[PDB]
Amino acid sequence: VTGSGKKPWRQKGTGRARSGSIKSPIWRSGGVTFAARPQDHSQKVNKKMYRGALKSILSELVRQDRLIVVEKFSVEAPKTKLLAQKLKDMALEDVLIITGELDENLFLAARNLHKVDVRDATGIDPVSLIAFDKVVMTADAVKQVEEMLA
Amino acid sequence: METIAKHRHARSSAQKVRLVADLIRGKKVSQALDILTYTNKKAAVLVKKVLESAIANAEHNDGADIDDLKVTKIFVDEGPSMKRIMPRAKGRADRILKRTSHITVVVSDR
């Protein structure tokens, strides 16, 4: 805290509570007693624990019928209208599309749909798998994911 | 029916203005004006000006007839104080409070 280190008043003689610093945390405009520092909150996940959680999440999605497997999931043009029509056809609103390798058309089309995400098979995460109501994986994505989780 | 007049931030202590305002309560405005005329108080001057303003508001905005008009309500609230410094002996400093008051007079035909 900005300020000087002078004793605000002398130690004895004044009928005042003994003070030593204008920057005391008891004082208004003084320091914070345990002031925050910028800290790193990320914790460690064992590789096996992370992979076991992914396997458990995928098993749960299959049991809950939230996982939809398909072949090709593409759109002929980078058109949000096209992807929205395709999802409305497939009866999908909140969906996480996991493709073999990222298609530029599909990525550009999905970028403006906020209930729609498009990951690469390598870029799936537990929070997304749980957070989206439907997870549409292609067959190539399923193969890559089982290889990654074996 | 009821007519209010206020002197807000009246430069006087609420205690003294209340001394004066206790004299005219539930009294006809004529008697109240006589009492405030012959009360020897700065607060009496203030309260008389407020009561006259009330009578005038009643006879200009709410109707007429000063005669059928009593001081139904009169109260003195405290207002903001003005803080001043007064030097005392041996370097000490006191704080004077210039106290003010809101004088409110409600007259009415009842």
Binding site: W9, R10, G13, T14, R16 | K90, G91, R92, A93
Partner: peptide, 14 residues
């Protein structure tokens, strides 16, 4: 304030 006078000396209980 900024100036606090020294209190008067106590009675010398000696």
């Amino acid at each position: 304030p900024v100036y606090i006078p020294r209190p008067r000396p106590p009675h010398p209980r000696l």
